[PDB]
């Protein structure tokens, strides 16, 4: 990554790599892997991100899907940023193509040149956006359950049922409004009768804290 | 390595060495070892790379093959960079021979002198290129399987079969186009009938995500 008043470049540390590898091996494609990745690659260059993606042993199907997603994003970027004709002036620097953002046709010094520019051309955060999108699609695709199937057991504590519910919801393929609707509908809709009657008695304007406090005794 | 605005030299850390050694002991010559190596030797000098290669216990056949590959690369470099006659001027510095790039006939201060020059003579990244080439040949040679033999089991989930497929493909000895052909042909060609019919029905213009979503139920 590159950290701050001038910016300074440093390679990815051994324990950032080890951390990422062990996270992939232990948790595979759980939702919380996406923040960890973004946490382990803050300020990183395309070379660092490609380093983290190449160090993945196994899971080659998911890595291929991620490759295809990055291909879509880079192609769209090239569509939105057309090529221009001429040699680059001595003072200036060319604008990054989709292949340069992925670190394929760009050196480390060119990426540092884009990220250190004023105004900055944040190639690392753009490439990070594409990668994180692909990771979203992989996580949502490898989710075994559906939000519609989460139902509270007869003798299951309300806390556990809500845990399962939002656990499944976090990996769902839905926009913000759709998740709002799922929360305001299926949660009370799929609760067990003893607690479901109480939650219906509370009303749709109740907080989760009041719902879990209400069904704590049952 | 040497990190950045002036460059500063630092030796390889204890946990970079320990990381590399443990990676070699655990994973031996798996594909993902090559990025890790390149991740553990970013900005490194020939002395650091030779340090990482010399700390390998066992696997002496592979290390010998790597030695021979480096010999080929250095000989070719000397062919492309002919010797010149005369003493070096006080202000200037000689151009590195193939033996200097491998750190054999060059001191640490001379390598720092080549990497700190403007324009830089990146001896460490060149030597790194030769080493990574040799590692490619070792990985491809120690691959037990072939891309032609990967076939989906009758009751094997499509995800697992694709995982095996690209796992074997990553270690294959083939150019980019040959791997494109292998992907666009053998993957659907070697799938089990129930899923193979669906993948044939999709058409050759389908993404891997649509193929794995299509064969998820079966």
């Amino acid at each position: 990554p590159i950290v701050q008043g001038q910016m300074v470049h440093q390679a990815i540390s051994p324990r950032t790599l080890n951390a990422w590898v062990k996270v992939v091996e232990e948790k595979a494609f759980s939702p919380e892997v996406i923040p960890m990745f973004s946490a382990l690659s803050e300020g990183a260059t395309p070379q660092d991100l490609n380093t983290m993606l190449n160090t993945v042993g196994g899971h080659q199907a998911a890595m291929q899907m991620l490759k295809e997603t990055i291909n879509e994003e880079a192609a769209e970027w090239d569509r939105l940023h057309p090529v221009h004709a001429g040699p680059i002036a001595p003072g200036q620097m060319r604008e990054p193509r989709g292949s340069d953002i992925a670190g394929t046709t760009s050196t480390l010094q060119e990426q540092i040149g884009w990220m250190t520019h004023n105004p900055p051309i944040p190639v690392g955060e753009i490439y990070k956006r594409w990668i994180i999108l692909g990771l979203n699609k992989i996580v949502r695709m490898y989710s075994p359950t559906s939000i519609l199937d989460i139902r509270q057991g007869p003798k299951e504590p309300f806390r556990d049922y809500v845990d399962r519910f939002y656990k499944t919801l976090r990996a769902e393929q839905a926009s913000q409004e759709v998740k709002n609707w799922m929360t305001e509908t299926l949660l009370v809709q799929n609760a067990n009768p003893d607690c479901k009657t109480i939650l219906k008695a509370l009303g749709p304007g109740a907080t989760l804290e009041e719902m879990m406090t209400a069904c704590q005794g049952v | 390595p040497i990190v950045q605005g002036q460059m500063v030299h630092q030796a390889i850390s204890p946990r970079t060495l320990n990381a590399w050694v443990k990676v070699v002991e655990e994973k031996a010559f798996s594909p993902e070892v090559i990025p890790m190596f390149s991740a553990l030797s970013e900005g490194a000098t020939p002395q650091d790379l030779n340090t990482m290669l010399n700390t390998v216990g066992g696997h002496q056949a592979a290390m010998q093959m790597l030695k021979e590959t480096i010999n080929e690369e250095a000989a070719e470099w000397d062919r492309l960079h002919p010797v010149h006659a005369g003493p070096i001027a006080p202000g200037q510095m000689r151009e590195p021979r193939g033996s200097d790039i491998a750190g054999t006939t060059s001191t640490l201060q001379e390598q720092i002198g080549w990497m700190t020059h403007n324009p830089p003579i990146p001896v460490g990244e060149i030597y790194k290129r030769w080493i990574i080439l040799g590692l490619n040949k070792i990985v491809r040679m120690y691959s037990p399987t072939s891309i032609l033999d990967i076939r989906q089991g009758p009751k094997e989930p499509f995800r697992d079969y694709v995982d095996r497929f690209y796992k074997t493909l990553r270690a294959e000895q083939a150019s980019q186009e040959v791997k494109n052909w292998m992907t666009e042909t053998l993957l659907v060609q070697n799938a089990n009938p129930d899923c193979k019919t669906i993948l044939k029905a999709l058409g050759p213009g389908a993404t891997l995500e649509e193929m794995m979503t299509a064969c998820q139920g079966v």
């Binding site: 395309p46 490759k67 | 494109n180």
Partner: peptide
Amino acid sequence: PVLFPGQPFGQP
């Protein structure tokens, strides 16, 4: 395309 099957990430 920028990435290809069986090829490393960020490779020319």
